[PDB]
Design a protein around this motif. Structure first.
Motif, PDB file in Angstrom:
ATOM      1  N   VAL A 308       0.839  -1.193   0.000  1.00 59.61           N
ATOM      2  CA  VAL A 308       0.000   0.000   0.000  1.00 59.61           C
ATOM      3  C   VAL A 308       0.881   1.254   0.000  1.00 59.61           C
ATOM      4  N   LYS A 312       1.063   4.041  -2.840  1.00 54.06           N
ATOM      5  CA  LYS A 312       0.700   5.404  -2.489  1.00 54.06           C
ATOM      6  C   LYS A 312       1.817   6.376  -2.894  1.00 54.06           C
ATOM      7  N   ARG A 335     -13.571   0.672   6.384  1.00 55.00           N
ATOM      8  CA  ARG A 335     -13.724   2.104   6.179  1.00 55.00           C
ATOM      9  C   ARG A 335     -12.351   2.760   5.989  1.00 55.00           C
ATOM     10  N   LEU A 336     -11.355   2.351   6.774  1.00 57.68           N
ATOM     11  CA  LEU A 336     -10.034   2.932   6.668  1.00 57.68           C
ATOM     12  C   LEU A 336      -9.393   2.572   5.346  1.00 57.68           C
ATOM     13  N   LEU A 337      -9.643   1.361   4.851  1.00 56.33           N
ATOM     14  CA  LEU A 337      -9.078   0.912   3.584  1.00 56.33           C
ATOM     15  C   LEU A 337      -9.719   1.662   2.408  1.00 56.33           C
ATOM     16  N   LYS A 338     -11.038   1.906   2.462  1.00 66.15           N
ATOM     17  CA  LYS A 338     -11.725   2.738   1.476  1.00 66.15           C
ATOM     18  C   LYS A 338     -11.152   4.159   1.438  1.00 66.15           C
ATOM     19  N   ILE A 339     -10.863   4.736   2.610  1.00 63.34           N
ATOM     20  CA  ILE A 339     -10.268   6.071   2.664  1.00 63.34           C
ATOM     21  C   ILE A 339      -8.857   6.071   2.067  1.00 63.34           C
ATOM     22  N   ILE A 340      -8.074   5.008   2.262  1.00 65.80           N
ATOM     23  CA  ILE A 340      -6.740   4.927   1.682  1.00 65.80           C
ATOM     24  C   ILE A 340      -6.828   4.883   0.154  1.00 65.80           C
ATOM     25  N   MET A 342      -8.965   6.445  -1.793  1.00 62.67           N
ATOM     26  CA  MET A 342      -9.447   7.664  -2.439  1.00 62.67           C
ATOM     27  C   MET A 342      -8.239   8.534  -2.846  1.00 62.67           C
TER      28      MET A 342
END
Lengths: 342, 341
Positions: A308, A312, A335-340, A342
């Motif tokens: 990741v 990134k 939820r944290l993985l979805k935010i990463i 974006m």
């Protein structure tokens, strides 16, 4: 009316298989001070006929026509940057030093850094610049104008892919295809459309890669691009994989070998081969794939975290999804993985 | 330099009348002289836009080669800054002139940079800015010193946006030491202050008060320090004299709410927060909003939303607000660190 554009069209329609061998000869017989010689410079570079581009630069750099001289000097900087004889900071310095009179080279000037910056992941600011360019400012060479239109559509396409803006990436790749008959631009457009479907649609990914592979036939570098991507596609979807280069020592080829071994459940050999890639021959995006593969074997969250991080750093919002999916499977906060992503 | 001597006299003896004295003086200078040239930089570095443009108009009518050249290049700068042209037309216009002076050669390089930096694209800028060698300016030390500040301020701004807080301070401090242009001092002190919001309360406060002192007289610049001092004290749960209870603006009403949360008047905090929900608000405001809702309800969902809106507005600084709270609620520290990259 352009005589150069007329010749290219005749060669493309009547002798497509002999395009390079006919055009090379013809481009090198043009007087370097002429409009046709200038167009030839763009034709050569847009097609990535490197030895031709460089022969034309050598002549035009020292031509007495001011426009030709200017095209020569700016393509010279482009070529130095593309070959890696210089870095982007020096490229820009040299552009600054030259007094650019033409609209064409003023706009090209701006695009030169973009080919380097795109290659290593800087997207948002150059996107704004590309949309700002108005090619109607080029009044004096419609061949450059039409070629630059395609160049822009392909860049935009590639930017939007890396931002995981796949509808927009396709829009611009399709516009590039419609806009051109330059093989290289068709290749990159089909690569992009194909890569856009890697996660969402196997068949459409494959079909865009095969369309591009058909167009690429004859150029072995362009062929290799589709084979690498088709090899990744089949490995990713856990299908039988005819596309892999077992001979190549290149990092991206050895990674496809590894991925296949993982699918075949030869995890011991996959690891030893992955462990030998540890010599630092790899960019950030390559380390993304590396630590993902290591994760697939070891199931260590650390490998996926590293994967990741590298995705990134290289600003690949497409492939970062792979280790994120795996971290979801290991029970990490969705939820944290979805935010990463974006 | 006679110009530098006058400016210094006006700054030290008539600070409150600086603009009204200098405007008059700058416009009475002969446009062929070095002093009129320096005036052009003085005007632009201070963002005295009307003045800058009047001095530009005067450089065209000058016959001095150098003055004519400064006129045309500041003209391009101003056209770009007003948005009458884009950077492509700017570069095109730069190409039209043969630039003889080292100062306008360097300034011509900086003109695009102001546009490219108005829309991200930092990294490539950093290296270009450090590549400029101001020792090439032999002929106007006032421009040399002003340009040095321009460089330090840009670099400072870049590093802040990259969340390189040590580096942003390094360049902000250099800017401060280098200048007496009020707006550069203001931006430098804001920057240093903002850099310490999360690491050092006392140093954040001290830099904001220093900047507030320099800002006295200008209502816009004053307001920046008051907004930030209000936030700082609310964030660190300190007694808060900076809150504007009168203002209906979203960021001011948010500071009222935050204070209420610190005073544990959660009922009133909620009702006031609930009424902001029907007010025009950008994504960055939604960051602060959902953080405050989180502070009240202690629902993770509010903090997740706060992170998302800070990420959409590309605020790498205040996103840490929601991250820290999620860490306290036992969320994976590695995922939170990755979000703040």
């Amino acid at each position: 009316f352009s005589e150069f554009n007329s010749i290219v069209n005749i060669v493309k329609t009547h002798y497509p298989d002999q395009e390079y061998e006919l055009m090379e000869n013809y481009c090198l017989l043009l007087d370097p001070n002429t409009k046709a010689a200038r167009s030839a410079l763009e034709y050569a570079d847009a097609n990535s006929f490197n030895t031709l581009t460089d022969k034309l630069v050598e002549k035009m750099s020292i031509a007495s026509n001011l426009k030709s001289k200017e095209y020569g000097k700016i393509y010279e900087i482009h070529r130095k940057l593309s070959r890696g004889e210089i870095d982007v900071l020096e490229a820009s310095k040299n552009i600054g030093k030259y007094r650019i009179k033409t609209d064409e080279m003023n706009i090209f000037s701006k695009m030169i850094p973009m080919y380097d910056y795109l290659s290593k992941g800087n997207f948002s600011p150059m996107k704004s610049l590309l949309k700002q360019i108005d090619l109607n400012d080029i009044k004096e060479n419609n061949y450059l104008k039409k070629s630059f239109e395609t160049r822009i559509y392909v860049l935009l396409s590639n930017i939007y892919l890396n931002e995981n803006e796949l509808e927009l990436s396709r829009k611009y790749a399709e516009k590039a295809i419609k806009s051109t008959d330059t093989k290289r631009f068709l290749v990159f457009s089909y690569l992009t459309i194909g890569t856009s479907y890697i996660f969402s649609d196997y068949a459409l990914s494959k079909q865009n890669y095969l369309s591009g592979y058909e167009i690429a036939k004859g150029n072995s570098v362009f062929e290799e691009f589709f084979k690498r991507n088709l090899s990744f596609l089949n490995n990713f979807w856990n299908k039988e994989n005819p596309w892999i280069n077992y001979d190549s020592n290149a990092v991206t080829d050895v990674q496809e070998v590894i991925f296949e071994l993982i699918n075949q459940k030869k995890l011991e050999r996959a690891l030893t081969l992955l462990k030998s890639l540890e010599r630092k021959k790899q960019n950030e995006n390559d380390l993304g794939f590396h630590y993902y593969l290591e994760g697939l074997i070891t199931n260590d969250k650390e490998a996926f975290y590293k994967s990741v991080e590298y995705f990134k750093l290289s600003q690949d919002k497409l492939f970062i999804k792979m280790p994120l999916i795996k971290l979801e499977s290991l029970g990490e906060n969705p939820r944290l993985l979805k935010i990463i992503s974006m």
